[PDB]
Symmetry: D5
Subunit: 104 residues, 10 copies
Amino acid sequence: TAILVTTRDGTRTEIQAEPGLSLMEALRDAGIDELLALCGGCCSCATCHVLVAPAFADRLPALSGDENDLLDSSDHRTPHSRLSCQITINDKLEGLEVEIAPED
Amino acid sequence: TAILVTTRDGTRTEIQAEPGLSLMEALRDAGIDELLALCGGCCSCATCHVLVAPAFADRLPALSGDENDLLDSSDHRTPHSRLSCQITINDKLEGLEVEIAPED
Amino acid sequence: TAILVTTRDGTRTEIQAEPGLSLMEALRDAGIDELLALCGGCCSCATCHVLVAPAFADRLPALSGDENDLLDSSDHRTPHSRLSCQITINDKLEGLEVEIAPED
Amino acid sequence: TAILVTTRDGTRTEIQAEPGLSLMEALRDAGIDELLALCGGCCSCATCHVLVAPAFADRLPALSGDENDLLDSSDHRTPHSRLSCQITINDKLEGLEVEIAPED
Amino acid sequence: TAILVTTRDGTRTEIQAEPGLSLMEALRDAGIDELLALCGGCCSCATCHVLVAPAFADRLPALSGDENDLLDSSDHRTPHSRLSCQITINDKLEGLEVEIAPED
Amino acid sequence: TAILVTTRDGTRTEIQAEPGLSLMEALRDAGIDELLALCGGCCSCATCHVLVAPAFADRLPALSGDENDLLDSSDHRTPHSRLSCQITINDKLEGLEVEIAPED
Amino acid sequence: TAILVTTRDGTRTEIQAEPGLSLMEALRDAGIDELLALCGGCCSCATCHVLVAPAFADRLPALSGDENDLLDSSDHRTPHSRLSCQITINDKLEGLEVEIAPED
Amino acid sequence: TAILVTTRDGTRTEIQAEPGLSLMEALRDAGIDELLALCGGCCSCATCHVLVAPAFADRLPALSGDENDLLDSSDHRTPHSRLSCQITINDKLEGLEVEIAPED
Amino acid sequence: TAILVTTRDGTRTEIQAEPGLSLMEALRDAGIDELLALCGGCCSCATCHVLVAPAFADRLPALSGDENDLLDSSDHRTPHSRLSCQITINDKLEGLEVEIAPED
Amino acid sequence: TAILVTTRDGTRTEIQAEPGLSLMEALRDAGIDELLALCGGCCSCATCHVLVAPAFADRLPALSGDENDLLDSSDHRTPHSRLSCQITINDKLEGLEVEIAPED
Ligand code: FES
Ligand code: FES
Ligand code: FES
Ligand code: FES
Ligand code: FES
Ligand code: FES
Ligand code: FES
Ligand code: FES
Ligand code: FES
Ligand code: FES
C-alpha cells in the first residue's frame, strides 16, 4: 500500500509497498538506497531507523525491547522513532508518512 | 483476511482477521479463548504459541531471537512454532493455516 | 482483600490481604511460613511461586519477561504460575484462589 | 481511586482510577493522551515515564531492574521517576500525585 | 564453489555456491528446501544447523559465542555443528562437505 | 554497630546499626530519610549509593559485577562508591564512615 | 561466631567464624577443605554451594539473581541452597546450621 | 583478491587478500601494523575497526549484534563501520575500499 | 613447562610447554590433535575442555564466569574442568596433570 | 619477572613478580598501593586498570569480552589498557612496562 517517504535531504516520494514485506524491504525495493540495512533486517543495528508520523503511532504494532534498545543508541531517536525492518506492511498503514532518520 | 485455525481438540475453524492486528489478537477477537496470552502480547511468555503450516513459513516475518528463546521453553516447539503475538495480519497471510500449540 | 490460599499439604486458609502490598508479603504476613521469599521480593528467585486459579488470569497484570524466565526454572511451572511477589493486592483480586507451588 | 496528575504544561487535574489497572491505563482511560505508551505497557520503552511525588515513594512497589534501565535512557529521569505501566492502581495510592515526564 | 551436501535421508548431492553468499543461502538457492532459515540468517535460531566434516574445520572461521549458544539448544549438536548462515562461501571452501542436521 | 554518616549537606552523625541488616536498612532505620531505596535493596537501582571512606575498603566484601554496573550509571560514582544495600552490618564495620552520594 | 557445619560425610563440626569474612572463607580457615572455591569467591561458580537449615533462612541476606542462576546449574540445589562466598558472617548468624552440598 | 586500504595517515595501498581469511588477518599479513587486534579476532574488542566505502556495503555479510555493540563503543564509528576480523575474504570483495578507523 | 597430559584413550605423554602460551596452544603445539579449539581460543566454545588434577586447582588462576558458563554446557563437566585455552602457561604449573575431557 | 611499573605520579620502580600470580597481585605484593582492587580480582570492576607499553601487547594473551566491557567504562581507557588482575605473570613478560591508569 501507499507510503510517503521523506529522505534525509528533504525530498519526498510516494511508494507502493507490498503487504507482508517489512517497511525496510519496501523502502529498499523502491530504491531508497540511502537506508542501509546493515544487519539485514534482523533487529541488530540502528541503520533502518525512520521517524514515523505521530498520527500513525496507533496503527503500528508495539515496539519490542530489543528495537527500543537499538533505537536508544541513536542520537536522533525521538518518541516516534521506529526500526523500519520491524514494521510489517499491511492495509492499516495506507498513507503512512515516514522520514529516514539522520545518520547514526 | 481468512485464516484456518486448528484448536487443541483438533477441530478446524475459519476466522476473519483484520489486517494490522497480531494473529494472537485476531484469534481472541474471533472467540478462540484457548490461547492464553499471559504477557498480553509483549513477547515475554510462550502461551500464545502456534504451529504454522510449513507452506506458509516464508510468508511470515523472520522470527526474532527473543521469540526463539521463548519457544525453546516449550516441550511442544517444532521448527514451525511461532508466537502468534509476533505475527502481524496482512493479505499475504490470506489462507494461513495455524494450529494452537498444546499447553506448556 | 480476601484471598484463599492452599498450602503444599492441601490445607486451605482464608486471609485478609492489605491493598498495595504484594501477594508474597500478604501471604507471609498471614503466617504462610512455607513460602520462602529468598530474594526478598526482588524478582530474582522462584521461591514465591504460586499457582493462580484460571478464573483469575484476566484479573492479574501481565507477567514480565524476568518473572517468566524465573518461573521456567521450576519443574512445576504451569501456564497459571505466578511469582507472588510480582502481584500487587487490590480489590480486583477479591476472592483470589492460589496454591503455593510444590518445592523447586 | 483519586489521582492528581500534572500534565506537561504544568496544569493539574484529578482523575478516577480503577483498582487493578496500571497507572498508564488509568491515565489514558481518563483522557490524558499526552502519555504515549509505545510498547503498549510491556516494560520495553520509556514513554510512559512519570514523576511521582516523594511522599508516595514508599506506597509503590519496588522498581525493577528492567524498569530502572529503561528510565536511565531518559534525560529527565529523577530518583522519583517511574514507568506508569509498572504501577498497579490500589486504594493505598488514594490521593497519589504524579507528573507526566517531559518528552524523551 | 562446489559443496557436497548430505541431506537428512543420507543422500549426497553436489551443489554450486557463489562466493559471498552464506552457506545457508547457497544451500537454499540450490534447492535444498529441507533447510529452514526461520530467522532469515540473522543468527537467532538453530534451523540452519549443519554438520561440517571434521577435515574442513580448520578452513572455516571461528564460531562466535552467539552461534555456539544457539547450537547448544539443539539435541543433535556435535562439536562440528555450525549454523550455515554464519559461513561465508569462498574458494578455500572448495569441496566442503556438510550434512543437514536432524530436526529440533 | 557504630557508623558515622555524612549526609548530603555535609553534616556528620553517628548511628547504631544492628548486625545482619544491610547498611541501607540501618541508615534508613536510624532515620537518614535522604537515602532512597527505590528498588527495596534488591540491587536493581542506584539510589542507595554511598561513598565509603578509603580506609574501610579492605573491611568490606568485594563488590559484584551487578553492583559495579549500577554504580556506573551515576555521575558521582567514585572508585569508593558502594550500594549500601549490598553491605551487611558486622562488627568488623565498627566505626565505618560513609557519605551519602549526591543525587542521580 | 559459631557455625555448625555438616560435611559431605554426614558428620558435623562447630567452627568459629570471624565477623566480616564470608562463610566460604570462614569454612576454609576452619579447615573444611571439601569446599572448593574454584572462582575464589567472586560469584562465578557453584563450588562453594551450601544448604542452609530452614530455621535460618530469615537470618541471611536476600539471595541475588546471579547467585540464583549459578545455583540452578547444580543438580543438588534446593530452595535453601546458598553460595557460602555470598554470605557475610555476623552475630545474627550465631548458631547457623549449614551442610556442604554434594559435589556437582 | 584485491583490497584498497587507506591507512590512518590518509595514504592508500592495494593488497592481495587470500580467500577464506578475515579482513583483519589479510590486512596484518600485508603488513598493516597500524591495526591492532587486541582480542585476536574473536569479536570482543573494537581495535580491528575499519570504515567500509559506501559502494561496498551490499557486498559484505550482514552486521551481527555483537559486532554492532562493540562498534558503538568507538567515538569514530559511522554507519559504514565494520570490525575487519568479522569479514571473510572472498571474490565478491574484489576491489573493496576500506579505511582504518582512527584509534579509540 | 612439564605437563602430564592424559588423552581420551588413556595414553599419557609428558610435554614441554612454553610460558605465555595457553594450555590449549601448548597441547596443540605438542601435537595433541584430539583437542579441537573450535572457537580458536576466544572462550566461546567448550571444545578445549580439560580435567585438571585436584592437587593443582590452587595453582591455576580463578575461572571466569564466562568460562564457567561454557563448561556447564558439557555433559562431562566436573568441579575440576577448565577450558585449556584460558590457562596461561607458567612455571607454577610445572608438572601439571590434565586429562582431555570426553567429547560433548 | 622484571616489571617496569610507572605509578600515577610518574615514579618508575622496577619490580620482581612471581610466575602464576596476577599482575595486580604482583603490583600489590611489591607494595604499589595506588592500585585498588575493589572487586578482589574477579574481573568485575575497573580499578586494577593499567596501560601496557605497545611493544608488549603481542606478549600478553588476548583480552576477554568481559575485560573489554569493564575497561570501556573508564574515561582513561586506551587501546593498550588492560585489567592487571587478568594478566598471569610469566617469563614471556620479562621486562614488561606498565603505567597505572589515572583513577576513574
Ligand atoms: S536493518 Fe538492522 S535493525 Fe533493521
Ligand atoms: S502473549 Fe506472551 S509472548 Fe505472545
Ligand atoms: S521472592 Fe524471589 S522472586 Fe519473588
Ligand atoms: S508503556 Fe512502554 S514501558 Fe510503559
Ligand atoms: S537461519 Fe536462523 S540462525 Fe541461521
Ligand atoms: S536500594 Fe536499589 S540498589 Fe540498593
Ligand atoms: S566460590 Fe565461586 S561462587 Fe562462591
Ligand atoms: S580483533 Fe577484537 S573484535 Fe576484531
Ligand atoms: S577454544 Fe573455544 S573456549 Fe577454548
Ligand atoms: S580487580 Fe576488579 S577487575 Fe581487576
